[PDB]
Design a protein around this ligand. Structure first.
Ligand SMILES: CCc1cc(-c2n[nH]cc2-c2c[nH]cn2)c(O)cc1O
Length: 210
């Protein structure tokens, strides 16, 4: 019931505004970036479980699932990585935090491809190349399950999630722009993923719709 609204740090808001309005054609990079983020979070929990096995009491499977839902026009990317506490969610998605966002925005202004975004640590925002709204549900061992959501415009919300319990991990729900529904087609997801899966050390499974 209690929803808190935050402003993105200015640089992020600037990045998002560019992203959400660009006609940049190679929009498929968003999937590579989300998968990469998932893989990084899976690395984190897996590492932590190397000295502390109870870390996986919330789930032993380490994987990434892709779930297209044509009826709801959403593509969902779920991982069983380390997850984010409320603080991590606000800091990570609402601020420049650990990234070279400023550096990236200068290189964008210098004729650099947006596909480089992952190299500057802000790859997540490429989701707005295809989505009008993104919801991020996450569960970290040390906190409750939270839902972050933003349709850009400069603000995002965070609330405790009353939805289906995740054991641990992060689920990114992309509410797709009307003209970007190719990303709910099995054949297109397969093509994009067939290309990146060889780099990711966790199973990536596409849920074909029935
Ligand atoms: C919404 C951005 C995002 C973050 C995570 C994540 N969860 N917990 C930690 C991370 C993370 C840290 N570094 C990269 N991803 C993740 O697992 C997937 C994602 O797409």
């Amino acid at each position: 019931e209690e929803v808190e609204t935050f402003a993105f740090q200015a640089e992020i808001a600037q990045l998002m505004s560019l992203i959400i309005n660009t006609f940049y054609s190679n929009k498929e990079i968003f999937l590579r970036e989300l998968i990469s983020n998932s893989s990084d979070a899976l690395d984190k929990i897996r590492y932590e479980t190397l000295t502390d096995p109870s870390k996986l009491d919330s789930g032993k499977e380490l994987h990434i699932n892709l779930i297209p839902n044509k009826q709801d026009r959403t593509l969902t990317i779920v991982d069983t990585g380390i997850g984010m506490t409320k603080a991590d969610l606000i800091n990570n998605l609402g601020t420049i935090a650990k990234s070279g966002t400023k550096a990236f925005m200068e290189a964008l202004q210098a004729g650099a491809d947006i596909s480089m975004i992952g190299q500057f640590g802000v790859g997540f925002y490429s989701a707005y190349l295809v989505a009008e709204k993104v919801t991020v549900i996450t569960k970290h061992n040390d906190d409750e399950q939270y839902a972050w959501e933003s349709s850009a415009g400069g603000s995002f919300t965070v609330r405790t999630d009353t939805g289906e319990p995740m054991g641990r991990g992060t689920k990114v729900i992309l509410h797709l722009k009307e003209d970007q529904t190719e990303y709910l087609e099995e054949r297109r997801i397969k093509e994009i993923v067939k290309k990146h899966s060889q780099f990711i050390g966790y199973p990536i499974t596409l849920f074909v719709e029935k």
